[PDB]
């Protein structure tokens, strides 16, 4: 089967069956990176 086995939980439920009236996905996400400075004259 495909409930009780395993062959899936690492994905995400989001949505398009009929797909491609959707052209168009370049989908992304950032990372911010915060303030480093060291200790010492660098």
């Amino acid at each position: 089967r495909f409930l009780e086995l395993g062959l899936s939980v690492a994905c995400i439920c989001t949505k398009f069956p009929e797909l491609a009236y959707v052209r168009d996905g370049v989908i992304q996400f950032e990372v911010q990176q915060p303030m480093i400075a060291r200790d010492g004259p660098h």
């Binding site: 990176q33 480093i36 400075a37 060291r38």
Partner: protein, 41 residues
Amino acid sequence: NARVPADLVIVGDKLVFLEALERRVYQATRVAYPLIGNIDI
């Protein structure tokens, strides 16, 4: 006082913190994690 998750190992007769701060601090970035010094032979 406040409860805080950290690992404490008993060695000899003294209870000492066992901190390996490389993950919480110095992480994904531009700082020299010390304890990686070099020796000359």
